[model samples]
Target chain A: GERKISRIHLVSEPSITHFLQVSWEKTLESGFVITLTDGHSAWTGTVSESEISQEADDMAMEKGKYVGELRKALLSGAGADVYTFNFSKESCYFFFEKNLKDVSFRLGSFNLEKVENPAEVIRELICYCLDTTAENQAKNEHLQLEFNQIKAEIERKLAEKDEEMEQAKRNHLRVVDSLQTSLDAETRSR
Target chain B: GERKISRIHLVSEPSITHFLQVSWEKTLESGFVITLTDGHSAWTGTVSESEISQEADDMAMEKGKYVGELRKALLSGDVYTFNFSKESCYFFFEKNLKDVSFRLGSFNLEKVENPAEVIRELICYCLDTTAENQAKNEHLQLEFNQIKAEIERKLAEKDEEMEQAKRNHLRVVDSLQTSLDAETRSRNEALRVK
Candidate 1:
């Protein structure tokens, strides 16, 4: 089977201010192979439409409604309501490809430069991991302590109640045994 | 034959706002138990602590020392330079137990839930069957209170039995006195006849 195709494009204001052309084609079982161009440069990538659907299932819309939404936004002409492209990281929007800080599609103005970086993106990514983690520690430190304290306090009270119950049980047996012995002795003497 | 217990408490400032206490206890060939309270109603729960220690070992941490630190945060005193409580899924501040935002295998598949904005139902059902045991946690408080009331009844019954035993002892003592008096009089009468 061949890939079925549909296309949408946005022509920028003032000739080269910003232009976006998106052609997303559906393939087998409804995955996505898309080509995007901003009048000057274009980029192609494949996002398994199934994966997007699964995420949408975990996210917004219907099982397959997410892919429909993306194409709808692109198709909604220039000077249209700005559709926010929602995803996990902002890196993909700016990336032409892996580590190639080239711009594929942008809604606004400016002749964006394709920066030829001299290092692996992993270095920046790892630094990001450490940075975010440290930030998390600072922000949640007080909140976390508060959570732990409450979790612990509940435990203490419950244990104390449990021990009280245990002691009461043993005391009950002792009290019963002594009272029963006294009753028997009184009856036998008579 | 020794019981090891490590405890941790979170102290809120100004002394009476809120509180949390944790006790991690272990016994030989046995699992550990925990008790917690909110300075009000208390609850106790137990699970095998070893599995988590072993879990972190396979995943991260220097095995033996990791186990030591595992209980330390549960046992260690006040905010001494901030220790981290990390768990899978709930990675940030141990909040991974609930909300999460992390890159899946596909970087494109990064589903980001805002770290704190509570996500409520908008569309699609999250059919979760894995979370109802927590309802049992709420129900456990019910079971505990029920048993405690039963103990109160039994204790009141024991007091009634003790009163019955006291009444019977007094009656028994009076009868013994009466018999002794009769025997003494009969002995005096016999001496007079002799």
Candidate 2:
């Protein structure tokens, strides 16, 4: 069908909030979809539902104050329980997504409320998501798919492809290829 | 030489309408050989791509949904934009390769999509690749080289392994302790002759 019939809406609160706060973290750890978009693309990660605790243990560390800093960062949020860190710019923001009130669901079982090590677990997740490799694949795939899909979309919109549209396709393709190349280079570099 | 190929399809409005309305959704999302055979593997997820999304807000909701559901069954369908976390289960359908048509390259690309979460990212790139051991070896070698180079740089700056050799030595003395007095006397006599 066409794009018109498709419905994309963020679910209402409680559900949304539960996802935002607790369950989202679990999914993040469980390697849930962190990004989805046009061009018929998707992704998933490898962490299991039960593996969250172990992941948090592996995550909560940085030389001397591994436990303390993690504790402080997490506890500092007062009412909240998760700490967010941005490594792209090396910034740390601690807050809880109270809306998210659960951990995960695997079938009918919904594991709400993480029992321990929320910050380290969440931070490691963020690190994994923003990881250069993950970022490259996600972003470039999205971009390329979007770019290609959009071109087809616009051509459909106009009932024909203009020279400019064609040029734009080439340009986007070039950019996509360049990004892909850089990603490949980084992948190979490592 | 570069060969240019162009593809154009002409279909009646009704056919196009049917395709656009009903078929495109299925076609758009999948790049795989969607057949009865693939049904089992794709459903099982063992040989298919693990789906993911980066839409943080949606994933949160999905997490919430999973939490709400809590282990009875795997939560399916859309949760978040970035939290594309649907998994595959192995349920094979009887089909032959002749019935298959999904292109592997595009399908594989779709399957490998991963969440941008840090640890998830680790599990995907660092953890998975490093599992091969060679990646770990290469990583270690690179790190070791950096350390080795630093040591050499520091040593070069110090420039003192050889020492100012001349001054910090005793004159060559070969006499035993008991014969030192006699040896000194003999040396003094020899010096006198000189």
Candidate 3:
């Protein structure tokens, strides 16, 4: 089963039978993943960029071709397909569907426990947004600082690799030259 | 018709016959709008958060309920759906697909062609993830220097740094891509030489 994750800054029309939703999974290894299904076809992948496939052997699921087709369908601006973004942890799916029939809504799944109290839900949402904004601010700073260091280190490594790689590069050039010379000599001898 | 903005790190499965693509639209008054169609139904909205609908009369499209459903479907961690990060101004849909069938690539809407760029410009400025903002909250910047002259200097620095940081990330992406391609080419050349 998938988790409810978080709500985004959008809602749907004819919202009674249909509402905007994003399905996620929170595994210990990879933070979050999203899944989409159309008819009998389905695809799932990690948001943090991890790889996932249920069948394990199906190359199509691995290639994620379904995702491309789904993307084209959504981009066509025609149907009720899935789009994702990050509202929590700074990732969300900002998808907005025009019409949602009860059957299509039922064809899939969700956690529509009914807000019970729209006022409370709305309030919670506001606070939640605030909390996430602040928390994400801190997180982003931390990531940026760490990433900056990583980038610097990568540059340093690249600098070192430059000298080494140049030598390797020159070595390759010599090999190519030598091979061409040998080929020319063989041709002349023949 | 909705435009096929740009492609990013994503792909489609064999039987699934689907993919993770982002839809966008361009206009003079607003900017780019994205529309998602499932079956016969459709919904269109701008990434800059503008709005659109073919059946303007229908309230369903107005509320974008279909969007909500699609959102839920994507969040389910099951199907091949769309997720984005703003890599340019740090606003990216850093979504990753495991076995991308081909490249495990991604899709994105371009900034210059649409309002997505400016919208992020607004977002980046407001987010203000700078030492000035952080230090100001702690009142540390004031303690370090006298108010009048120093504040002017610091504020100028902040403004400059904002653009600098934006470009930094953009440069980072390009740099990473260049390195990746360089690595691939070198490896291929080395093997062919062997």
Candidate 4:
């Protein structure tokens, strides 16, 4: 139902921080929307094509300064964690959403790339969300499962070793008792 | 035409650090090739499907460990620093058919379809590059800023301490003068009594 075209990384500490990156082959006017929700509260923002272009130009002129301003705005504004970019209809949209607090639900993006198949782009966006959210979670869950299985196997092996050691000790004790009885018999016979 | 899939960020140092993140909708068995050139020397590696899967499993087991191994391999291999641009790393699909080519950073990739393939190459390249460079310049810049801030702080503290010392000196002088005057007056009184 969806295709993944970008990557979004979220860190929840001090404040919720998100890093978003995407790339496109062609150049055109694009629109972007990003919303972050923690169930109780939701922050959302939309960027028009013009604003995106202007930002892109600013970025081209002074990439560091432009990124700094965008970072500041995203961190400070109400719903700042939820912001958008157009990439001037070309290239990637890299956003660093910083210092977002008390939000935990999920972050999603609604984007329109001026392309032949908008459906393709939408599918890609959806796939990106699924891959980041469900797919990533599933992968981690699988890892945990594997880890547990290995741990259980190790524990079982340790238990088996313990049982073997106990059985050996019992066998040694019986042998010693039999030897003692034979010695006593020998002494009496002598 | 070629499509862009992922970005590989490089850190400059003896052991380079790379951060690679990719998003893919389709999960086709794919491979990637990454070539890094510092104009003087070029180092390239092709990661096949099986290797990728193994790395993924290892990553699942120990995320940073696998990445570190890869980074070590890339850095120690062949690529050396000669003022590389974003175009230093060339990325491509490890397929029989040649597809489109798109330039990214100092590297360019051709015959790419799925973002997954691009991502795979990015990871491999990132690991290889990380082995060689740690974004040393960036690290130095941060260190420089920290030192600068510390110096400024020390200077400000020193200034405050010196001002306090001046005020203390004035107070001590005022007290000594008062004490001296009182002693002289008492001495005069005693002399007059005599």
- State every prediction's TM-score relative to the real structure: 0.23, 0.18, 0.21, 0.22
Worst 10 residues of 4 chain A by lDDT: A1-10
Give the 10-residue window scoring lowest on summed lDDT in candidate 1 chain B: B118-127
Number of colliding residue pairs in model 1? 18
Across A115-170, the per-residue lDDT of candidate 2 in tens digits comes to 23333333333233234334455544555555555445543644332444455446
RMSD, one per candidate, in order: 24.2, 29.1, 29.1, 27.7
Note the DockQ of each predicted structure.
Answer: 0.01, 0.01, 0.01, 0.01
Q: What is the interface RMSD of each candidate, in Å?
A: 17.8, 31.2, 24.9, 32.3
CAPRI-style class, candidate 3? incorrect
For model 3, how does the per-residue alpha-carbon lDDT over A98-124 read when each residue is reduced to its tens digit?
Answer: 234442221111112222233222222
Q: How many collisions between residues are there in candidate 4?
A: 27
- Model 3: residues with Cα > 4 Å off, grouped in runs: A1-116, A154-190, B1-194
lDDT of 3 by residue, B11-83 (tens): 2222211112233344312334432222112223344443224222233444354344333333222233344
For model 3, what is the C-alpha lDDT against the true structure? 0.35
Q: If the candidates were sorted by their lDDT against the true structure, best first, what order would they fall in?
A: 4, 1, 3, 2
Candidate 2: tens digits of C-alpha lDDT, residues B60-170 = 435333233311111111111111112331221111245453211111112323222211222233333323443444455555556556545644533332132211211
